[PDB]
């Protein structure tokens, strides 16, 4: 089930946080398909968290041959369709990591983007958070599978207004990756 490329680093980050299991947030990436040359839709979603969170900051990773559709290249902002889970946010920002990537991402030929949402109170919702579009290379081979996952940075968040560290530990330790599969 693990889709955090640097899971052992994350584990260390949460070493002293009690590990309570039970009812927490289930963050997931989609499993979609696209023809070579097309723009593949990818959606991050969260279930079991309606009205229970007030901020997130998440790094999503993907093979770096895939390029996320940009909103403003110079601000590095990434185009996305906002989902129901981010409705009534006070602010949301989505940006592409272009410079100064960690060696674990370069070594494994990964690109990365980051989505942060901020709410006033625990207004965070559930269902789809954001849908992005990725350019599938023109020369991609049918049957090719592109794995989608996460990268854990020490300042990343999935938290409630009450700032209860165990809620965040659960969210990050129960994330599910996704795929894009190239079809004919």
């Amino acid at each position: 089930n693990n889709a955090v490329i640097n899971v052992d680093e994350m584990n260390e980050a949460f070493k002293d946080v009690p590990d309570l299991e039970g009812e927490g947030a289930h963050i997931t990436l989609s499993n979609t398909t696209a023809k070579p040359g097309e723009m593949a839709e990818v959606t991050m979603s969260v279930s079991n968290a309606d009205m229970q969170w007030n901020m997130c900051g998440i790094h999503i990773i993907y093979p770096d041959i895939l390029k996320p559709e940009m909103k403003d290249p110079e601000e590095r902002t990434v185009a996305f369709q906002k989902g129901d889970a981010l409705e009534a946010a006070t602010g949301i920002v989505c940006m592409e990591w272009q410079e100064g990537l960690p060696p674990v991402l370069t070594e494994n030929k990964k690109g990365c983007l980051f989505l942060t949402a901020m709410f006033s109170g625990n207004q965070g919702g559930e269902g789809d958070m954001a849908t992005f579009r990725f350019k599938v290379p023109d020369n991609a081979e049918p049957g090719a599978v592109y794995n989608l996952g996460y990268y854990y940075m020490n300042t990343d968040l999935f938290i409630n207004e009450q700032n209860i560290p165990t809620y965040q530990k659960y969210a990050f330790t129960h994330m599910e990756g996704g795929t894009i599969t190239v079809e004919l």
Binding site: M55, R76, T90, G91, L101, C112, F114, M118, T155
Partner: protein, 231 residues
């Protein structure tokens, strides 16, 4: 036959200093070095006026440690003004001011603002929190490089991540303190961790400041409300 004269001026070497409007003292650590020069002009009385044919420089003397800021404090100096956050604070030696070498009173530069005012408009509100979030996202996606990211949308910064006004905004915006080096008011933007906890803290301070139970505190004792927020 006329005439003989002395006065004295100061060469002052100082750094800028950032302060919240709530603070009760300026830091004399801003003064790196001060030296009292003394000139002796002599010559003759002129037709309405004075002519100087000679001047004798007596040995100048370090007075860095004797210099104070008199009765000025950040709290009694702060004045809300659009796009203006700098003040020249007079130094005092023997309880009086000193001229510099240009005949103006010797001063030190300070900047004074409201904690939480990322965008330098003299109001702490949700837009300061969303600016800070934007900086959080940008530094989460560039290797924590502060030199290519402007934190404040203020026109005083104007998109220049090296502006002194961005360091100041960072000082104002870093409301949640972080584990690590214990930072002073003299920290550079690059040394501060400004992240989603700062953003969220500013948003919470604003929201609480807007509701009836907190209005008195927000107006009169805002540090108490920041402490409530950041715990």
């Amino acid at each position: 036959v006329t005439s003989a004269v002395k006065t004295q001026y100061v060469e002052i070497e100082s750094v800028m200093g950032f302060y919240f409007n709530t603070e009760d003292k300026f830091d004399t650590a801003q003064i790196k070095k001060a030296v009292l020069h003394t000139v002796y002009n002599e010559g003759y009385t002129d037709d309405g006026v004075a002519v100087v044919l000679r001047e004798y420089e007596s040995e100048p003397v370090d007075i860095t440690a004797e210099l104070t800021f008199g009765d000025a404090t950040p709290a009694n100096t702060y004045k809300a003004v659009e796009n203006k956050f700098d003040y020249e604070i007079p130094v005092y030696y023997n309880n009086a001011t000193l001229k510099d070498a240009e005949g103006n009173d010797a001063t030190v530069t300070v900047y004074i603002g409201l904690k939480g005012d990322t965008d330098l408009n003299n109001i702490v509100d949700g837009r300061d929190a969303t600016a800070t979030l934007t900086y959080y996202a940008a530094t989460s996606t560039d290797g924590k490089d502060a030199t290519t990211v402007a934190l404040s949308p203020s026109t005083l910064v104007g998109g220049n991540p090296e502006s002194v006004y961005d360091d100041f905004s960072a000082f104002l915006s870093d409301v949640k303190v972080d584990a690590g080096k214990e930072l002073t008011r003299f920290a550079k933007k690059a040394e501060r961790l400004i992240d989603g906890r700062d953003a969220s803290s500013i948003l919470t301070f604003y929201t609480k400041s807007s509701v009836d139970q907190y209005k008195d505190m927000a107006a009169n004792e805002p540090n108490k409300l920041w402490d409530i927020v950041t715990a």
